[model samples]
Target: VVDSSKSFVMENFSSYHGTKPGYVDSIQKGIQKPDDWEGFYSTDNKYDAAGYSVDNENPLSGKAGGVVKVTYPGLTKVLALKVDNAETIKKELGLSLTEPLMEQVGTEEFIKRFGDGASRVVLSLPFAEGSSSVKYINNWEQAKALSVELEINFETRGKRGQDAMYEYMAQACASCINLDWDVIRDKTKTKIESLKEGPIKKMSESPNKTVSEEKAKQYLEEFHQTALEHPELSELKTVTGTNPVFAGANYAAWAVNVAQVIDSETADNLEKTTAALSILPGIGSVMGIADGAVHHNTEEIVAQSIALSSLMVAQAIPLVGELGFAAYNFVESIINLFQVVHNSYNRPAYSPGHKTQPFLHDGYAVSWNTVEDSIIRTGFQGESGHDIKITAENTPLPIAGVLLPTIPGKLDVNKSKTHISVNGRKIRMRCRAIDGDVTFCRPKSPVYVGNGVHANLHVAFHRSSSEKIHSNEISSDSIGVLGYQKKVNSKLSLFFEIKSMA
Candidate 1:
């Protein structure tokens, strides 16, 4: 016997005066139609409210209420239902014929009796014949999945009155649905628009803060409207035990609450009403502004209203970060593609020192030229307030004359020079002549261009021409300076000039 530790009972409230089927059923016995309150109206008295006491031996001694305490066996929670008037409203809810008991089991145990991954076990209890048995399901996963889809009379065959109450229970227990704010706001707006057909709208239009009992009585005179208004806080509190969500009556109650609150705010002529309405989940701002109007705690109301807006903005940060990272990677890849092309085209100029023939070791040489101090160093320190800029120059060294005898005469060294700048009080350096053997030598240092602060780096490129390289290599038609600049945020900038062999 699986232990039935979690079971709850509900008092099915009834408008019916006694325990017999009324009107439609009583007609067969020559009884006249019963009065409205004498028969059941809504099975949706439909709130789940009590449970089987854990220590009680009888489980019914102190538990049962008005009509009957129907135990929803093997359950962890409670809900409501009304049972006094027989099948009138009961059949509509599909609970008139027989109530199915629930039994729960572990996944492994369920699979042993049924099959792999088995979740539900339906038993036709021999004692009840057509009225029948209990439903067995695995743990929470199966519990949450139990939703009643087809109507009782349709595909249900004989399992009558089995409704979506369990499904609602699952939703409450699982806390699964995060109700969307936009849809709720839109629904609130539509309710406001169609309020003209109802008395509540007229009462709301008057802009009064309070209502008299006589007018309230007159407004609720009709049965339909009276029944419509039955879901105030009491019924709402009752229904919430089963699920925070309610169907018809719940909406009616909240809508009325919203209308009354909006009316009072309008009476005060406060434009903040719209902002409050926008911030609310259909059910929320009721307490925020409702208490605000009565208690004059407008500060608390404003604080509550502003809190959700801040929550929404905080939720958006991760999504924004995802987009930013995506863009950074895309731009980085394009820079890498350019670096590859630049390196392949300029390979000869920056390649390591190596022999071109048996006797000739060919290399492009570099040598430092001069240094300049634009202004004298000052005592005050900062990159922007620098009193002087140290400028240092580097030039190419001619090695082709001695290394390449094929050149019939000597070649002149190129006269161009470039200076790199550092922000400081003073600057000095050791100038050296880099000959063929040392130029582009072993343990090579290649210049890189990128942001050190952001931890990004890319290979440097030296362009020789203003005119596009139509054939992929630099030609005599190329113009302008032949170098690239790399900058770093650590208060320094470097300018490198490319010196090519003649």
Candidate 2:
């Protein structure tokens, strides 16, 4: 009942019926006695004799289940994160942790039971620190898995945090039932592509082009209005009016969901496209993997955007602080500003994270900046021996490929190139932390310096030593990533050392 009728199929099945009486009779017979029906499936070879059979001579198998097939030989062991009561759930559901979840459950069954394979349930990838956990779930079995994750976070100690977390997530997921997730997913991709071709591409080409506070304000206003008027999220306006907390949480959740769908499709298309192009001779084959990797890195900005946005939402709720969580109001403010409102850019300083955040307001965050960054990265990732000096202090500086407002403190960096080989690329990332901790910016693609070679780097900036925020906590797959922290006197000098290969 919580799900909207619009998201699911209609109650009526008039379209399913056959015009001929005999065709209808056959369908009835097939349903009543499937064994006797020799049409699609049967005990005899008649079904195979007909052209309806879809049996492949050499069927491909892969746990990932994509158009292209990949094989893992020998003892290809897969690790699963141990959770409380995980064994019990695995035993009951007859699931193996080593195998992909979909491989065990089967996509058809999930679709039949859960309505469709949407964001009703989600298992986020292993983030930094090598930890994976369920982000959302609807059914009883899935709920238990989520609860086990919450238990490990010490939220189950008093149970207050657990209760609030579950309630808010439930409200967010349930309230989003009216959204046409598939349509929204497609629309979002179109917008990303459009933004890439237009504004972002232009910015990358225009080295002297600069964005001012005035122009930024106008863009923010129009962007906010677009978020408010987005057809996919129109129904959410009512939800905000009724419940601000749920509205805010749902908005964050929905953004992540959209990003996930986009990621999956992009990944699939890349694989298929690479496979098609690799069939050609020599250079075409080389370009297949090289170009695919470059494209993958560029597109991954969408994923990082969702991850940071998710962090902001978790901190924004007042109840989180009351539950004994360490409150860093400064970091949250900048993240919210980057993700949601342009008003935050013009403001003298980032507002306290404790204040009424803007995610619950009439407009939530949009993916425009991330889209622009993704596109911008593609152009620069190929620059040779290019030393890009980034100075971010209340200016429209393109950090990690995305142009963002740096307030409260300055984030200055000089990215110098080393070398790019078949193995990976070598690079050095140096940052000066002036005031407060800086948010980690991950640009996925490798730098393709002139020659037919590319080098990749993943960057991470820790909050502070006292916070015990691990530099290795940001999840990304790129070469030459440095996550550790180094302190130099009052002004901290941070170096993100990158390995030659991922």
Candidate 3:
């Protein structure tokens, strides 16, 4: 169920339908077709707006990736027919015979045997049956979902008139000519099947984000090791790494931004600059603008690099207190993403052919959020309001990193540093001085938008060696940075990216 084929069939999945042979016989005799307002056209499951001609025709990417253990509810029983005499019944139904003669299932026996039992002969029903050179229903979509192959009909079978269809089934089954359809078909459809969720097995678990209690002491150990090694000058002006790692610069840059870096007459450490870097190569990689430079401001690099490396210490453990925003939203996003997906899958999907669907709104199908920021709809309707038992794995997760559409926010600053500060919303960016290259996409802390969802903007101006890609989807609903790339005739990349692990 996880390919790009016949996927559109999801919209018209049928729950159940049945008919008798006598009805088709009457139709063949010029019986006017019944109106299908409430949804039944009755040409032996071929009427109304209900034929599956456009089925496999609209196959979407077949299904999602991954499979689980076998399962899902499907058809269990079909309409069964018993005829004492086929020709006589046909003549009677068609109004040719002066006398309507037919052997009927007795009432006493009908009640005792009518419901849910095998061989419980149903009386006075005539459905169209075709005498086919071949026996194929030509419906693989339904069959596949039902977890069956030869259960329905044949693809090679030719078409026939409604009456011809009835005669064919009777002729085959009455003489026991391999024509027992309703029972078999019904059983197959009603079967509460437990099949695989996908075509393959998915990862049993996700990556681990845990760290030891002493990781705090550990990071400083490395910094001092590097620092001790360069002790004479203490440290470099900046320690550069790929991710726009603002908070992960190993530290927060707030003290500096607020440290008089932007004051009218500060050391001019606020000496504004921008690396004006280009988008990167891999998931989190970036390519710096040649105008941008790195690793040169010996003093600032050392201070900033050490501060940046210590960021994980603030985030990985509880409040050990190092004086700044102490949480890594990236790590938090990872934790929450898994939380939401798990909840969604357990919620089950909306089923199209549920018996009680119309009952929801006094005969109306309700799904999809009709209004904004709210739900006035539904999706799957399984047994007792559960989602489809067939496959609950539809919303889909990507197998690799994704490219979100690039978002355009306001970027502001001047020469010494590209500091974009919006007063009411907590936001600011600081750059260091390097060989007069005011800003080279390096930062004293991790970079990102403010805590609020207003117009606050954040930019990732690291370099060609980043290690992560943007995580938020940049569509109309996203409140975060978008992962984007350019294509076609647009500078903005397609608004789509691979979503593998997190």
Candidate 4:
């Protein structure tokens, strides 16, 4: 018995005269089963009732009975690669592709033998590009019909990935990562508002226009330590290895998992705060903070300090080669300051192709950056630009956004912009490759990236004549983000009260 129980419900109902009295017959008080009557057929429902559930009796599910085939989804190599890395993208990019969960995965049976609904889902293959992406682009329009839409959104995730998409037509859905950000935000917000009412507020007011740097640092450090631990946040780790979607990394998954998490949220909020936390050494507040009259901006300072440390926890999380918090427990409560709102009616359920699995995880096996470095150096492509595949040496993360086919010439990379010599011609990205808000200085540039980390870029292109793609081809490197990690690491120590947005 994997489940252990040491209870004290007692073996007797001596004082209680209920169904079939003389309940205990004096059976030992330890493992009692006075009401061991099994099956709905054993008892009858009085008033307006149907009956007990027997749907799981078939699989010994210990619930109801049903003759159903239960097995894991297709476990292929490439399929595994895609799904395994799906959540990695979510962490870095903030969007995970869950198994096409078109149906609610509750255990209560609404109509059938089982009491609740069950979801056995797969990563949405048809919806995404499977090995055969170009082959079936319009499967959505060709489908028998659009699922009767849920809440106020579009289609949900079907079986995960490629050709597997067609297999899942109907499935209730949920997000890949199971986090409750709202509750956490509210709690953090309340905590911050209260902090402002005292010590922090005292510093902001500066006690008659005199500034005390020591007291300010003390307050900041105090808030920083408090910000580090949030035990109630929900947990969701990136799924790799055993998962088939990101299955490609037979062992690469291990390395990719070791990468660092960029402090994207920290820099984002800091930038948004403008100058409260933006104190620079020797050249402080050259921009927004303005070394501005302290007494003039007390309100702004309080807001910035409180805002910066909200709803955060990394618990030894790395910020560069990889990203994300393990065991983070920040939760959410949807109804907020506006009071209760947005209540809706029941949703309609339909016949689904597959059921969904709950969003849960123990851990993943690898480092995501190691694998993405190679994939970006080579695999995948662009829009009308021809789903292109190309190979090159040295230059990693050479471009940002999608690379279009053009006359190849020169590929120049720098902080302000990324230039690529494609199809034998030269062209520059219309915007700066690096977001100038977060990165203070790149290993390559002294220019402070205002903020945000472009840990990876989505690359796409088409190979011109004589460019033959290989199978177990040549080796590659993530030349683009290699040094970028150093830029992220060297500064984590300086920024103490940084918070990660869920």
lDDT at residue 452 of model 1 (Cα atoms): 22
Considering lDDT, which of the candidate structures 2 and 4 is the better prediction for this target? 2
How well does candidate 2 match the true structure in TM-score terms?
0.18
For model 3, the superposed segments whose C-alpha errors exceed 4 Å read 1-502
TM-score, structure 4 vs. true: 0.19
* Alpha carbon RMSD to native, model 1: 32.9
1-502, model 3: which lDDT tens digit per residue? 1112211112222331222322322322321224101112122222211122112322110111111111113322222234435454445335324322212222233224332332222222233332111111111122233321121221223322121232233332231222223332232222212111121111122111333334433443343333323322222223323335322222322211221122223212111200100111111111111112222222233222323222322332231321222122222221222222222222223322222121121111212111121111112211111110010122311111111122222111222322222323333434333322222222233322222311212322222222223334123221111211224211111111222222
Per-candidate TM-scores read: 0.14, 0.18, 0.16, 0.19
Number of backbone clashes in candidate 3 = 109
User: Which regions of candidate 4 deviate over 4 angstroms?
Assistant: 1-178, 181-214, 226-467, 477-502
- The positional error of residue 286 in candidate 1, measured at the CA in angstroms, is 7.9
What is candidate 3's TM-score against the reference?
A: 0.16
Superposed Cα deviation of residue 18, candidate 4 (Å): 55
lDDT of each: 0.23, 0.25, 0.23, 0.21
lDDT of 4 by residue, 15-112 (tens): 10111112122211221222111111110111001011122222111111111111212220111123323335335433224531112111122112
Candidate topping lDDT:
2
Better model by lDDT: candidate 1 vs candidate 4:
1
